[PDB]
Amino acid sequence: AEKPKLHYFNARGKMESTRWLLAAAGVEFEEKFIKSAEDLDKLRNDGYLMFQQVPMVEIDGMKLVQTRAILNYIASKYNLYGKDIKERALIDMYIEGIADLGEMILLLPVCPPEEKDAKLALIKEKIKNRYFPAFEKVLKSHGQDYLVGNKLSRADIHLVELLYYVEELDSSLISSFPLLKALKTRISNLPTVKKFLQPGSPRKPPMDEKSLEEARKIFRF
Amino acid sequence: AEKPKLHYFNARGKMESTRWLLAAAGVEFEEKFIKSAEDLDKLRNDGYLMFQQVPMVEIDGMKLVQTRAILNYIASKYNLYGKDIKERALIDMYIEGIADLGEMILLLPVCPPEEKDAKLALIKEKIKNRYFPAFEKVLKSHGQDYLVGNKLSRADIHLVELLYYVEELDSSLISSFPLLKALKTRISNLPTVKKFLQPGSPRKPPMDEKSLEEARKIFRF
Ligand SMILES: N[C@@H](CCC(=O)N[C@@H](CS)C(=O)NCC(=O)O)C(=O)O
Ligand SMILES: N[C@@H](CCC(=O)N[C@@H](CS)C(=O)NCC(=O)O)C(=O)O
Ligand SMILES: C=C(CC)C(=O)c1ccc(OCC(=O)O)c(Cl)c1Cl
Ligand SMILES: C=C(CC)C(=O)c1ccc(OCC(=O)O)c(Cl)c1Cl
């Protein structure tokens, strides 16, 4: 029927976690790229964006805005949000930790040059002493293949996506965390995820200086 | 039985929305205040904070950290998160908008003096031209007393809490939004909320330079 339609600019940004989740669920989607501020304004004027911002996803008759709203709906619709509220609580706690670290890395390129060095150092420190030990500890606690309920959930998907970004940053960071390395492997081999990691998929590359300045002009940041 | 126990410092911060939610649901809770950095370190060493941070809420045998994880659990447990996946999607979209504006106002006090004047102007502009019209439009669209499903939800609670903060900032901002003003009144009269607004409740006052000074030392911000 109507495949979900993602509205954003041709880049990772705040739309990438959604592309990863849909793909891992095996859902085909279409993207409608915003190429100019004129494109954004038309969406605004047609009353498509509740808060005049993107990401925006057309799905099940709704024009959903706000990253967490979009991700929560999709995760629930495809049974990737756990089996009950206690499982959702563990999932939420884990993925909000992932969102904090992920945001830091996302904004690194937009960080003021005189601060870049400090920021990068703080991030690596947090990765090694706060975030990775926390997730490695969860996996060691139950010895299971998945983070929550011994079954695949959005938590494993979001985590593995973040592990790829950390690798791009510094591949040595994951060294002292074997369980995390193991999970990265298992999840990457699931048919849906393997197809998404392969050349030619909707997966997006890191942002280049040239494309980054047009984005900044359109969105103002 | 065991009442929920909230761990934070004596101030609004990121714990205030949880205080407002529990109270609106009629749930009594206890607070354990962090008075010094040594208090924070004890929690850390006791293995109570997954990511070495607070807010942390002890509830139903769990040591839940992360604001959204805590609020999602509580909203679900007390039937304040809608009746289905689609109602939850509208709620999430709305409250994520509230979270964005709320974060701006929360951080205003820790903003550079040089920047404050430009910041606050940006906020008031967003309030009048982005956020308030969006919510006023939702209420006008259905003509109902609540934001979603013609039944009280966490969305009405989060919104009214935000209206009080905007009032503290500039009481004239809500002027051209009659429906928002009406909602503020209606929600404030609910028994549980009215009791929370009264003197002596766990509701917290805005921050003062001395206390802000110390929060900053402890939390390093
Ligand atoms: N909290 C929102 C933030 C959305 C957001 O910041 N969107 C940006 C681009 S990534 C945008 O459209 N900015 C245009 C504007 O703010 O006018 C979310 O998570 O979706
Ligand atoms: N995204 C987290 C942020 C938590 C947070 O920023 N906690 C601060 C105090 S408000 C803290 O404990 N900082 C100490 C630290 O980061 O080491 C949440 O929503 O709970
Ligand atoms: C809303 C925007 C800024 C707050 C945003 O989501 C964003 C973040 C990083 C970005 O580049 C880096 C990348 O890897 O995509 C880009 Cl192009 C965007 Cl639009
Ligand atoms: C994590 C902290 C900041 C990164 C935080 O949540 C926070 C924000 C504002 C604050 O003061 C303002 C207030 O009105 O409470 C305080 Cl005291 C805190 Cl601890």
Curated annotation (Swiss-Prot), chains A, B:
Q: In which tissues is it expressed?
A: Liver.
The protein's annotated catalytic reaction(s) are: RX + glutathione = an S-substituted glutathione + a halide anion + H(+); prostaglandin A2 + glutathione = prostaglandin A2-S-(R)-glutathione; prostaglandin J2 + glutathione = prostaglandin J2-S-(R)-glutathione; (13S)-hydroperoxy-(9Z,11E)-octadecadienoate + 2 glutathione = (13S)-hydroxy-(9Z,11E)-octadecadienoate + glutathione disulfide + H2O
User: What is the top-level taxon of the source organism?
Assistant: Eukaryota
**Single Gene Ontology BP annotation:** xenobiotic metabolic process
Which ranges carry the GST N-terminal domain?
2-82
Predominant subcellular localization, coarse grouping: cytoplasm
Subcellular localization(s) per the UniProt record: Cytoplasm
Q: Which Gene3D superfamilies match?
A: 1.20.1050.10, Glutaredoxin
| GST C-terminal domain boundaries | 84-206
Molecular functions per Gene Ontology: fatty acid binding; glutathione peroxidase activity; glutathione transferase activity; steroid Delta-isomerase activity
Keywords for this entry?
Answer: Acetylation, Cytoplasm, Isomerase, Lipid metabolism, Oxidoreductase, Peroxidase, Transferase
Q: Quaternary structure?
A: Homodimer or heterodimer of GSTA1 and GSTA2.
Q: Family, per the entry?
A: Belongs to the GST superfamily. Alpha family.
In its UniProt entry, what is this protein called?
A: Glutathione S-transferase A1
Mind giving the lineage of the organism this protein is from?
A: Eukaryota, Metazoa, Chordata, Craniata, Vertebrata
Underlying gene = GSTA1
